[PDB]
Design a protein around this nucleic acid. Sequence first.
RNA 1: CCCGCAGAAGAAGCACCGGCUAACUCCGUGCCAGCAGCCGCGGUAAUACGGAGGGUGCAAGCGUUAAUCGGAAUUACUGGGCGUAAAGCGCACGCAGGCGGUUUGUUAAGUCAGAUGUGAAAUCCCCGGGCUCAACCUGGGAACUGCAUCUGAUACUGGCAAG
RNA 2: UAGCUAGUAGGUGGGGUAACGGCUCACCUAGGCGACGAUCCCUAGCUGGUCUGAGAGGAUGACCAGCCACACUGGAACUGA
Lengths: 80, 150, 129, 205, 123, 82
Amino acid sequence: KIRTLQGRVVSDKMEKSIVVAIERFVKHPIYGKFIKRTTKLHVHDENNECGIGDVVEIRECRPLSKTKSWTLVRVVEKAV
Amino acid sequence: ELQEKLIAVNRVSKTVKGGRIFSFTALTVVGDGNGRVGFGYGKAREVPAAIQKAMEKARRNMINVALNNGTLQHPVKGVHTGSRVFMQPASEGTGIIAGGAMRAVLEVAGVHNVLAKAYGSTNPINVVRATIDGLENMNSPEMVAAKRGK
Amino acid sequence: SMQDPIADMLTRIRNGQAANKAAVTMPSSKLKVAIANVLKEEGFIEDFKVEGDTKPELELTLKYFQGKAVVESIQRVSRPGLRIYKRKDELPKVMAGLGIAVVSTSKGVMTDRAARQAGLGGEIICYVA
Amino acid sequence: ARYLGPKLKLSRREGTDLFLKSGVRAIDTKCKIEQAPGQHGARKPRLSDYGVQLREKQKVRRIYGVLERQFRNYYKEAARLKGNTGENLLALLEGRLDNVVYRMGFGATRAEARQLVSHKAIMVNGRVVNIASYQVSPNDVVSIREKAKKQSRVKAALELAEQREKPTWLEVDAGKMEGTFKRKPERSDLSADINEHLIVELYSK
Amino acid sequence: ATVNQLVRKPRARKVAKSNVPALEACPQKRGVCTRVYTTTPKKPNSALRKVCRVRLTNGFEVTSYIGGEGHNLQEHSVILIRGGRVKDLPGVRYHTVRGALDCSGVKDRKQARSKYGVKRPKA
Amino acid sequence: MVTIRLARHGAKKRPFYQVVVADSRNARNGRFIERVGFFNPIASEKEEGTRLDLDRIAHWVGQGATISDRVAALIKEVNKAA
RNA sequence: CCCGCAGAAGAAGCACCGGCUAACUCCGUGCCAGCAGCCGCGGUAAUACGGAGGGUGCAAGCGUUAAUCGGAAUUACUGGGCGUAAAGCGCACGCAGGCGGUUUGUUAAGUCAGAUGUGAAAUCCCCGGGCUCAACCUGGGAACUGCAUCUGAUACUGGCAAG
RNA sequence: UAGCUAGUAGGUGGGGUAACGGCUCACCUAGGCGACGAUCCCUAGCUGGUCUGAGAGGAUGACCAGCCACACUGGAACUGA
């Protein structure tokens, strides 16, 4: 429980690991248009229990592999 | 009792068959310390008469300005034939921070404390007019309040 | 309009006033009417009335104190394509306070005189002047 | 620092009497006020909208003997204060010790005040000061040290002061020959024909 | 101009060439003054002027004008190139300093004496 | 080795010292942790020569901080005075 | 730092003067020597070159070159344009992208308010203070326009649902 | 510069370090990264700050301070908190 970065899983193929893509506004610093900047970030899912395209609630953990430092706490949407 | 200030002058020419006749222009600005401007522009053949004719056409077109207390009510912006002009009221004591053709119009209208700038071509003949455009488009707090509920 | 139903009403107001019309009509909204109250109570316009059920059309009854119009120049600021939001202190002043702005504050749409007294910034709908 | 000055071809250019010399010099009496500063005589001066603020900026600099570096420093620390920038310039030029020792009535011209100051003679708040730029704070009590109380000058130059006007922002007890810069000078009592709103545009380019 | 278009590629800066390429921020440069020209200016001018190829230190060979009230150089004297283009020759855009390195001053020259290598006749 | 040494900051011939809390390994005019009071060696009642904030020094000392040499005198010259 | 002893005794240059820009006269030169940031000067007076006198500006400095920003709204977010001045693809279709009518409900991501931490010190600003003044040093504040967390609002934007 | 990537992305186990981790080894999965600019090339220490600018911005990063990196060029490790 830090901020539990909601995201939409991109690719649940890879073993016990997923790719969650966070989406964010940010006002463009110099032009002022609210641009949409995605934040793709590897997530360790322990059972391959989430399918592509469902919003999950992920958390910071210690590094679990080279470039895999997030695990999810709970899923709040079904893939289809 | 009116103040009067010249702006510029020109060696305007003309090609006739035989020769090349020259003229002189003398745009002028006029007011008093109370927001009146008959900015003037008068042709002749030699400068003293152009200056006099511009004083004369000047002293006429007194299109009334709405001086606040020596400055502008609010940041007017003007334009006339490719010469944009920004004006903004400034603090007391701060002089006329204004360019060339605007220094004279601002001064003679009666203003003392404003800061200005011109952005298109800086041709005096049109800066003097864009400025005065802006200064007729003033809105005093008393007359904006007049045209609706104060 | 097809993508800016509010700059469209502002364009109605300051096209139908160069032509010097008494009243203008347009398809209403909730935000359009929320603006129209702030316009008509700062005296920028006489009075309005919305009417219609399938097509509730807003009609403002434009005002003018001479041949000149009371509304000098309204400016659409928060365009869809560049949304502009201000805080309670960086709220714009219009003609150094003589003219009115319209912002969407958390407690509704109002001027900036009142939303600066209320201590609550908003979303700059348009400059009214 | 002071550069030994242009003498009266100084005041001849500006027209008004810029006091490098004081005595019976007010009337011509070998001054030749505006006959010619030099090569050409009374040549008509076609000064541009620029020349007529250089003229007044160097009327002010050359009343007091300030220079471009000190005058621009005065400009900047007058323009960072609060209020009328021009009256701030004249205020912080009037509070200068070189000036005040003159306005006190001591000496006869601000070159004499600048020399008395530099020669330890004027001593303010009980401790000797020989910087001419010392901004005299209000309620100070300027004096003359014992060694220079009767030196040669202030006994007579003071008598060359009562016929002159009494500056009303400081009081002069000439009988005891110590003064008190009582309060801050204002524009109104600093009765000069100096237009500040030419200088301030000169510097605010 | 559309703010979206500016987002998708930034409003780019305007690049500007330096006027004096062989100096590259060095206010002066030494040279060899490898030989001397006297080529005439364009049509509007006359009075053929004194320019010299220089082998600067950094390998660039350029022409430099030898202005003054008279001339004193040679064909191997080392000179100090300065910058400050001349307006007549088709590209003599360096303007040798007078009286700093082994190039003498000017003769009997009293005014603007610092811009030339002569120094205080007793006076 | 947190220390409560002094850093020399004033101009030439006129040193001004901040009573700083910093570990030993840093150069005296390098990094530090907390700045608790200053010391102006000049005298003749120009101003207060020392203001020192004794409560944070007492905290740090009780936390394992070595109160240094000159500042040790600085402490009690305040307490002896007041 | 203070005090005594001298005597004005040891202490003034540099650029510039045709317009832009404060400040011109005389002579020599005669498209030559030369100048020049630009305009432009020099071919019989030339306030533009060289010299003198005079003035202007700055002053233990003052000029030139180099470099950066400004002026330049001349990359324009603030703050430009595209018929003819440079500039609308030869024309369509269209993925990604960008925008999105209207009412209600919901959320509270954008947004807004407040709060809590943090944003090193010095710099910058303000009221001071100490160096005979100032540069300089220095106390306290302000400021660091940010980030993160929390608690409210819910108009507008987004999501989800119903039209 | 439009494709790059095989210990390369992940998972089992060993092994390894003060410590997690392909950090290394065997094995299996066949992924990961890329138009929201990967890979490649050129230039460059980074910041508080500095100058300039009305300001947004621009240009910089000598001094002073925080972090980093190197110590004739290139490998390695010992000793030790």
